[PDB]
Amino acid sequence: LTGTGVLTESNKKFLPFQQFGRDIADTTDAVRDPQTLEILDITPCSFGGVSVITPGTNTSNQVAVLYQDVNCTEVNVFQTRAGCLIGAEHVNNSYECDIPIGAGICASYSIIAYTMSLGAENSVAYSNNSIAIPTNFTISVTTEILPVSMTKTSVDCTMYICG
């Protein structure tokens, strides 16, 4: 049976009459080599999704490349739970999420990557005999947009298919 992937040492112990091991939902997991009868775990070599983090060509042409769920030791370089990031400099600060990368990591424009800030931290002056009462107010107008309908489309299949 022809497959593709990397081979590694496996701690699993097979049975003498058993050649290869299949993972749940019928996918190959390990095959014992017939020459020395050694259990070898076979897992497919790393594949992932390539994503581009950009502030837009109007601002700058500089971009950062994200490889999703790929350990980039085999491909600035930063390692996140979402994968690997190249072209962004990691910083120890925290701002509002500009470009959502994932796993609590966001990028912003050089290209920097950081941990998103959930908001301004403030402690309410709580006391058992103290209140805050407003002496003034503001009138705020907020705009809310709600779709109500789309374009009505009809298809005449008999002529649409072949005319």
Partner 1 sequence: YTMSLGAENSVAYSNNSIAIPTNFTISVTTEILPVSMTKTSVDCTMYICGDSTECSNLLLQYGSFCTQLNRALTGIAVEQDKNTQEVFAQVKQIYKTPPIKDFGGFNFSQILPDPSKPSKRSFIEDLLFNKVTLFNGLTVLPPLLTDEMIAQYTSALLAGTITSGWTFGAGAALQIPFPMQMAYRFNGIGVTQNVLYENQKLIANQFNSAIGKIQDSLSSTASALGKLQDVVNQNAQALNTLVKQLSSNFGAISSVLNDILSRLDPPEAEVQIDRLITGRLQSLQTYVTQQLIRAAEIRASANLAATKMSECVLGQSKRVDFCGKGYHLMSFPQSAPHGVVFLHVTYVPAQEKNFTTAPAICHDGKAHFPREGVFVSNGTHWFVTQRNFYEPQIITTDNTFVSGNCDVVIGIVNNTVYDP
Ligand X SMILES: *[C@@H]1O[C@H](CO)[C@@H](O)[C@H](O)[C@H]1NC(C)=O
CB-CB neighbours of 101 under 10 Å: 24
Please tell me whether residue 92 binds ligand X under the rule CB under 6 A: yes
- Binder of partner 1 out of 14, 39, 41, 48 (CB under 8 A): 48
| Rounded-to-integer distance, Cα 68 and Cα 47, Å | 9
By CB under 8 A, the residues from 55 to 94 that bind partner 1 are 68-69, 81-82
Does residue 122 interact with ligand X by CB under 6 A?
no
58 is in the binding site of which of partner 1, ligand X, none (Cβ under 5 to 8 A by kind)? ligand X
Q: Is 96 exposed, middle or buried (0-12, 13-18, 19+ CB in 10 A)?
A: exposed
Q: How far is the CB of 13 from ligand X (least distance, A)?
A: 4
Q: CB-based burial of residue 34 (10 Å sphere; 0-12 exposed, 13-18 middle, 19+ buried)?
A: exposed
Query: Of these, 74, 121, 156, 158, which contacts partner 1 (CB under 8 A)?
Result: 121
Closest approach, Cβ 104 to ligand X, in A, equals 16
* Secondary element (H or E) of residue 51: strand 49-53
- The listed partner (partner 1, ligand X, none) that binds 102, CB under 5 to 8 Å by sort, is partner 1
Burial pattern 130-152, b for ≥16 Cβ within 10 A else e, equals eeeeeeeeeeeeeeeeeeeeeee
Residue 59 interacts with which of ligand X, partner 1, none, CB < 5 to 8 Å by class? ligand X
Q: Which residue has the tokens 């070898």?
A: 40
Residue 60 and residue 146: Cα distance in Å, rounded?
34
User: Does residue 126 interact with partner 1 by CB under 8 A?
Assistant: yes
Q: Shortest distance, CB of residue 47 to partner 1, whole angstroms?
A: 7
- Residue 93 partner contact from ligand X, partner 1, none using kind-dependent CB cut-offs of 5 to 8 Å: none
Contacts with ligand X by CB under 6 A: the residue count is: 14
